[PDB]
Amino acid sequence: MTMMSGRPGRVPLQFLPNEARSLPPPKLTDPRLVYMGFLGYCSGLIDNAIRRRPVVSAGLHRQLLYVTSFVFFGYYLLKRQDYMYALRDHDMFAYVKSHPEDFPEKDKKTYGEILEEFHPVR
Amino acid sequence: MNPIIYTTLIMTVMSGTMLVMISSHWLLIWIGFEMNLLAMIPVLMKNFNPRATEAATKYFLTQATASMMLMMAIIINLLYSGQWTITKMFNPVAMTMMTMALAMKLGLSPFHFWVPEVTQGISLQAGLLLLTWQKLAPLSVLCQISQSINPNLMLTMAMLSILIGGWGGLNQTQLRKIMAYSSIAHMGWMTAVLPYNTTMTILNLLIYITMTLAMFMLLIHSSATTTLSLSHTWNKMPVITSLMMVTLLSMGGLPPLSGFMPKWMIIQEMTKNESIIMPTLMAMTALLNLYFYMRLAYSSSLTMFPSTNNMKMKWQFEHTKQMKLLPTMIVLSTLVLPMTPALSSLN
Amino acid sequence: PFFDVQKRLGLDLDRWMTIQSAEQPHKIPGRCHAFEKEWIECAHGIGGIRAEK
Amino acid sequence: AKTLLHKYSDIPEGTECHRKAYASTSIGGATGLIVSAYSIALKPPASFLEGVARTGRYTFTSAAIGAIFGLTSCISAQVREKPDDPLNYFIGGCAGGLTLGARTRSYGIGAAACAYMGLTAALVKMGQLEGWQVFAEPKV
Amino acid sequence: PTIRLQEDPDPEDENLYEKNPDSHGYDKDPIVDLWNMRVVFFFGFSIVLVLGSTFVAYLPDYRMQEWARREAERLVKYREANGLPLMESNCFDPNKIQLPEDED
Amino acid sequence: NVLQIVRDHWVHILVPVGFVFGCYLDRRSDEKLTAFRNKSLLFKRELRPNEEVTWK
Amino acid sequence: LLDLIWLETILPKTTSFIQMKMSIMVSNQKGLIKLYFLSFLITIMISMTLFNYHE
Amino acid sequence: IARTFYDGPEKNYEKTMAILQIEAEKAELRLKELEVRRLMRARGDGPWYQYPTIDKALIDHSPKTTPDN
Amino acid sequence: MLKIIIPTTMLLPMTWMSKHNMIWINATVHSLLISLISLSLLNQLGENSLNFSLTFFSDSLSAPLLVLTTWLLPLMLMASQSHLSKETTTRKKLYITMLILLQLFLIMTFTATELILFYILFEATLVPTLIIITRWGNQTERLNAGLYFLFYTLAGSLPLLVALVYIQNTTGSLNFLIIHYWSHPLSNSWSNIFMWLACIMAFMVKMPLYGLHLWLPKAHVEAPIAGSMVLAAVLLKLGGYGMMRITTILNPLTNYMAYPFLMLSMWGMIMTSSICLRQTDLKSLIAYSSVSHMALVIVAIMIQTPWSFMGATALMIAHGLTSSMLFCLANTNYERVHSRTMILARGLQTLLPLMATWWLVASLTNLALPPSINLIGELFIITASFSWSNITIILMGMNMMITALYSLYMLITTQRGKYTHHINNIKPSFTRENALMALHILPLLLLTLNPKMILGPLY
Numbered sequence A: 001m002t003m004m005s006g007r008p009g010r011v012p013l014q015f016l017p018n019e020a021r022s023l024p025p026p027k028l029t030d031p032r033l034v035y036m037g038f039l040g041y042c043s044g045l046i047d048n049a050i051r052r053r054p055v056v057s058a059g060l061h062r063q064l065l066y067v068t069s070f071v072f073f074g075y076y077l078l079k080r081q082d083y084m085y086a087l088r089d090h091d092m093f094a095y096v097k098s099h100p101e102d103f104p105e106k107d108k109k110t111y112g113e114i115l116e117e118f119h120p121v122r
Numbered sequence B: 001m002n003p004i005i006y007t008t009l010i011m012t013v014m015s016g017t018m019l020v021m022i023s024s025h026w027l028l029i030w031i032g033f034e035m036n037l038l039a040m041i042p043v044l045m046k047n048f049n050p051r052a053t054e055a056a057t058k059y060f061l062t063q064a065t066a067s068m069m070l071m072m073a074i075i076i077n078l079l080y081s082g083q084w085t086i087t088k089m090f091n092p093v094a095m096t097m098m099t100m101a102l103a104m105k106l107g108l109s110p111f112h113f114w115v116p117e118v119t120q121g122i123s124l125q126a127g128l129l130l131l132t133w134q135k136l137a138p139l140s141v142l143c144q145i146s147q148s149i150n151p152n153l154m155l156t157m158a159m160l161s162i163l164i165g166g167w168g169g170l171n172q173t174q175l176r177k178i179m180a181y182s183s184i185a186h187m188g189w190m191t192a193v194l195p196y197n198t199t200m201t202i203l204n205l206l207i208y209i210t211m212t213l214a215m216f217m218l219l220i221h222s223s224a225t226t227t228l229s230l231s232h233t234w235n236k237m238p239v240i241t242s243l244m245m246v247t248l249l250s251m252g253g254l255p256p257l258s259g260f261m262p263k264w265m266i267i268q269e270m271t272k273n274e275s276i277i278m279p280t281l282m283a284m285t286a287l288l289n290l291y292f293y294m295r296l297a298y299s300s301s302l303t304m305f306p307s308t309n310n311m312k313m314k315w316q317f318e319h320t321k322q323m324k325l326l327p328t329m330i331v332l333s334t335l336v337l338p339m340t341p342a343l344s345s346l347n
Numbered sequence C: 001p002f003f004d005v006q007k008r009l010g011l012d013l014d015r016w017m018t019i020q021s022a023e024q025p026h027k028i029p030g031r032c033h034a035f036e037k038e039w040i041e042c043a044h045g046i047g048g049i050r051a052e053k
Numbered sequence D: 001a002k003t004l005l006h007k008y009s010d011i012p013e014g015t016e017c018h019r020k021a022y023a024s025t026s027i028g029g030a031t032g033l034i035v036s037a038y039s040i041a042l043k044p045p046a047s048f049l050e051g052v053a054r055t056g057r058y059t060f061t062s063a064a065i066g067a068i069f070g071l072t073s074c075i076s077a078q079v080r081e082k083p084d085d086p087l088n089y090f091i092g093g094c095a096g097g098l099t100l101g102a103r104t105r106s107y108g109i110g111a112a113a114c115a116y117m118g119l120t121a122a123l124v125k126m127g128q129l130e131g132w133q134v135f136a137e138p139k140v
Numbered sequence E: 001p002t003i004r005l006q007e008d009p010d011p012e013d014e015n016l017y018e019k020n021p022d023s024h025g026y027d028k029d030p031i032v033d034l035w036n037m038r039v040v041f042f043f044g045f046s047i048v049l050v051l052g053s054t055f056v057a058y059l060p061d062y063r064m065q066e067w068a069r070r071e072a073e074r075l076v077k078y079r080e081a082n083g084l085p086l087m088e089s090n091c092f093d094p095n096k097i098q099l100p101e102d103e104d
Numbered sequence F: 001n002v003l004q005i006v007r008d009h010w011v012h013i014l015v016p017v018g019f020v021f022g023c024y025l026d027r028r029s030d031e032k033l034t035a036f037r038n039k040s041l042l043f044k045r046e047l048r049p050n051e052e053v054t055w056k
Numbered sequence G: 001l002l003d004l005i006w007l008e009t010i011l012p013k014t015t016s017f018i019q020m021k022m023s024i025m026v027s028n029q030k031g032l033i034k035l036y037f038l039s040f041l042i043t044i045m046i047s048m049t050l051f052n053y054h055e
Numbered sequence H: 001i002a003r004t005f006y007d008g009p010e011k012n013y014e015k016t017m018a019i020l021q022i023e024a025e026k027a028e029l030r031l032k033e034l035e036v037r038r039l040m041r042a043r044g045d046g047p048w049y050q051y052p053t054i055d056k057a058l059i060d061h062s063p064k065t066t067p068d069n
Numbered sequence I: 001m002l003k004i005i006i007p008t009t010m011l012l013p014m015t016w017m018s019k020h021n022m023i024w025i026n027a028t029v030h031s032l033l034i035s036l037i038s039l040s041l042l043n044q045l046g047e048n049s050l051n052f053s054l055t056f057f058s059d060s061l062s063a064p065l066l067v068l069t070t071w072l073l074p075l076m077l078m079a080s081q082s083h084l085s086k087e088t089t090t091r092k093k094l095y096i097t098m099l100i101l102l103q104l105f106l107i108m109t110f111t112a113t114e115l116i117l118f119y120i121l122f123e124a125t126l127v128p129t130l131i132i133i134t135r136w137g138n139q140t141e142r143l144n145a146g147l148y149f150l151f152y153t154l155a156g157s158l159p160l161l162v163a164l165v166y167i168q169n170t171t172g173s174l175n176f177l178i179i180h181y182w183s184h185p186l187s188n189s190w191s192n193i194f195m196w197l198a199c200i201m202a203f204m205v206k207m208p209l210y211g212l213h214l215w216l217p218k219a220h221v222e223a224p225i226a227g228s229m230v231l232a233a234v235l236l237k238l239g240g241y242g243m244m245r246i247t248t249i250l251n252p253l254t255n256y257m258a259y260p261f262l263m264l265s266m267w268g269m270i271m272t273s274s275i276c277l278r279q280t281d282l283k284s285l286i287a288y289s290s291v292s293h294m295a296l297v298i299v300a301i302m303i304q305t306p307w308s309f310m311g312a313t314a315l316m317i318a319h320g321l322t323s324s325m326l327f328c329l330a331n332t333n334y335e336r337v338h339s340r341t342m343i344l345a346r347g348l349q350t351l352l353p354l355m356a357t358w359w360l361v362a363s364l365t366n367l368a369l370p371p372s373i374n375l376i377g378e379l380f381i382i383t384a385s386f387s388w389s390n391i392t393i394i395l396m397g398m399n400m401m402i403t404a405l406y407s408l409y410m411l412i413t414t415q416r417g418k419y420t421h422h423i424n425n426i427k428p429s430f431t432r433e434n435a436l437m438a439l440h441i442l443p444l445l446l447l448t449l450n451p452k453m454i455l456g457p458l459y
Ligand SMILES: CCCCCCCCCCCCCCCCCC(=O)OC[C@H](COP(=O)([O-])OCC(O)COP(=O)([O-])OC[C@@H](COC(=O)CCCCCCCCCCCCCCCCC)OC(=O)CCCCCCCCCCCCCCCCC)OC(=O)CCCCCCCCCCCCCCCCC
Pocket: D033, D034, D036, D037, D038, D040, D041, D044, D045, D046, D047, D048, D049, D050, D051, D052, D055, G042, G044, G045
């Protein structure tokens, strides 16, 4: 029920191991970052609407801070997420390699020699 | 209550929870639960009245019983292995006792009776605390000892929680009891996936806490605790009722809203472990929660109920106090489904 | 759920009291000190699943 | 216990219908006793003997349902020479539903219980045949 | 009061033709109404209907029906020019198939 | 003359601009799926004396 | 007979009636801790017997 | 119309080939990952599903006031 | 697919930043422009679908549905702006926003490459529709209608979610291309039977299948005019499209799992057509007619032949246009006399002649007069069903008769006879209403000239 908590050589509260730096960072126009910025913009607009201020005009410094905070946090969130998926794939490939008797390569047939069952539609 | 005393008590509640979360020794986890309860009883009675006294009394009795049971489980575990570290329980009987103690602390069915009464008896701020922060400690403990727990007892209590949350919520007109039954059903969802993937438990808990914080803050902003009192908010603050309508649909679990993500993730994980049947029941039963959310949205935002003459005076006054995190909470409660793969950062 | 602040900071807030084979006052041993020392050293670092078998 | 479920399922399907009926009656009686315990706890019966009467009513209804179900399903399986067939469990469950309806003396309850109990029992039989798991183990 | 509530009376609906005898039924403002009529008629009947129907009528033969007809013509010419069957009941070459060897 | 009529009719650029931006993003999406460009057994071809790619 | 009555009766009206009955059964508690606690005892006994004897 | 608004069939053809390769690789990767998770949870020999044991660094290996530990 | 999608999204802030008196003009103009751009998806390769990217693709099944959606949006705007005149600026913008979000969800659902994305968008369409019905619905009964529309739909779609995630766990993918190329037969087992049911029942309840159809008269009658238009024209077709996609992984089980659904659809065809003969409400009659038509589509999809799939596509498109036109025609009279009862206003041909012409043409396409595409679809389905079994002609023949009967009954009751003496507030037809009818009708007639466009992938 806890697959990656017990992995060896894992620092308790890093959020970003040093090994993560071997991975390409997300581009600054990453559509997920753009969506995080859009979330910040919606937060700014709802903020204006709740306090009965003009919705698109009232606080531009405030809306800018909303957008910037969301983009800033989202960048690091994306880094950590991509790093965790890289760990998953690394471990899966290493395990398949070290246990070849569990992942055998069997000879595959062309469809000319596989007998498939035919079911007429009528 | 002096403001400094209130701050000290909130800090003691939070520090008891953090003690439960950072400890490696069963005795320190028990001490964390004790400290949390000690500081939490006064926060329930902050606004003194007989109902708050009764709620704090029922809460204390339930939680202290759970505490005794928890300690007994720890001692039996020590008896069958000279161990104090919280890893995997050694004795099956100790594990049953521990599971039931933590279920009583969480309010899972059949131990669910206390949650609606205590929530109704206290203010909206104390209800917010009780239904968000008071879940972290037992859930973290359950996440640590997850391999040891028996699936049959856990899943029984989880399915009961979902069913009973739906059925009990169907009958309510008080908003605090609606929120409490909602919480019971949500806890059932969180604990159903626990023996399979604790990351799904954590994700469900985070999304539930976000939606519950948003709902409670919207209920405080429009100072309503009944259905008919919330039926007036349209004639003073229409934006609030529209935002509450959308938050209600997200709680229901309807796509493309965020509330749907936890349900979607949990069902998928379960199917991987060859468990088609439990999930089909869980979703078809969450339909009940969706029904009474929809009823509240009908009375509050989609139609207009009659109003009173004295509302005209309220039209002239702005809210004295504004919640800083309410806008962010609404956005995270509704518009976060496209960010689902970010759950990998939780493991 | 379990934030290991002790391991990150190297503190030992409660690890001194978790096992019977760990540094008692005046070197008084536990009744089952050798058996526990052996079981701990046998299962160290192999994980919970392998250690039980 | 689920030892009761095994004493039910250790008997083959279309064989020894009296023993299977006994086992199903035991299961039904246990269920009715638990139901009456919770009912007495959450809604007090105002006197000792009225609690005894409510217990007897609930337990007898449940044991009668179990007896009729097990008897009908085992007998239908052995007469039709058709084990491994959900129709026997459907017939048994519908008979048990009719028993519950005759007990509460309600035609609507009778018909509804016939239908839903029969469908549930047929589904349980299909799950036994195909290997469906209710409380699945954590495989992955 | 023998009443239940303070309520506005249900108003009668207003005829757009009363203040604007040629009102097109789009808006109360006669200018906005006229321009709504004009934009609807131009962008629906002139742009989408006529030009769109023309565009769809002259869509290139990407479905390859002319190509298929010419291909069938080549095949028929070659096949009955050589005395070969027009079509074979086997879609795929039987020499590229390896049936299971024994059938009993 | 054009100040306030721009200020009241500038909304008529949003949808055409979105159309142009969508065409651009479709081209960028095409630029990611070139692993088999001029590599299929049916359409593989010899490049002309001056062309660089068989499709863009 | 079919649209307005029986197709209504079987699927949606039955669902409403059943859920309404179960909601009334579940939510109508008298608020007495004696009764709630008594049930907790019943629950504890059941788990340690039909769940704790099974491993 | 074909010159102004569309392309040749080879572009769509080979884009489809690329799409199909990506999707089929993702499918086989998903199946392989499920199998790897099953094995790592059943055997405990993999990096995944590592449940904590007691740190051997806590043991005190000093004379213990009696010779037999 | 991005070129169609972004402008649709753009429509959102364009309407939120428009002047109070220009919202309808702006939305209508740019909706029509979007419809024109979409028109370019009808160019289809032949052998295979156009795959724009990993996420989106268009088919010959898909292209007709998208064009109908985009074309329906401006018509809904024309139909709405009359009864929404008294509304505040913010609420009018909210209504238009609901319609735009609905269009956006619909376009994405039809073009999503994989089933989980299709499921999410197919379910997301529920929220704007429910809000439209329950907030702008005229009657008290709208709240009940909303609940019926929601719950019937979710009770079908949640088992589909479970089935889909299970299928991706066992197969490794839900991408439709991989699903098609790696298809393997479904064995005959209880597990596979319930997988079939969980894959089929959501689309069955969307169609709707007879007996699970009770939500539709409620929801279609209690909705505002644009809600009814989109519910009949497009939202019913989600079930047909999804079924046509999903039945590729269900063979050969469909051979006998289809029997009860075929029986229900044929007999309920007869049943709903007969119901239309004794109906006192005029919207109720159009709703049940939609049910009868979709029963025919269900039969066509269940028998799984190329001719039946072609007929199903043609009938879906033709029904979408005709049913929307009939709802708009009924709404004009309702706007006049503020009642839905069919015998209240009579002899309207004497007072409104051009609207009577629109009524006649809509009634003629509803009964599938040759060579309209309604008859093309119906005839193709009837031929495929005849091949399936020669006895289907009796049921098919009976249905054709009852449809002619109630169509001409509606026409005769509302347009002919003498006018009710008391009603004196029947004003001349507005240019808006006549243009709305023409914009429904001209496209249908134009489609007869080029039948292959609406035929589908099998063609
Ligand atoms: C490590 C964890 C383990 C933890 C657990 C371990 C526990 C061990 C300790 C036990 C030793 C005793 C210690 C002292 C406890 C303090 C008692 C107390 O203070 O009472 C206060 C309490 C209230 O005090 P009060 O307010 O002053 O008095 C008001 C009147 O009492 C009421 O006023 P009224 O007259 O107006 O009300 C009517 C009357 C009405 O009372 C009734 O209606 C009861 C009549 C039902 C009769 C049952 C039918 C008989 C047949 C069943 C047999 C089953 C097998 C048969 C098989 C098939 C048969 C052919 O009373 C009630 O309604 C109250 C309900 C109380 C019923 C007893 C509670 C037990 C659970 C509920 C089950 C109900 C029976 C269903 C059957 C369940 C299975 C047996 O007193 C009582 O209610 C009863 C007296 C208590 C004496 C007996 C208590 C011992 C039972 C403890 C648990 C048993 C063992 C558990 C499992 C064992 C396996 C390991």
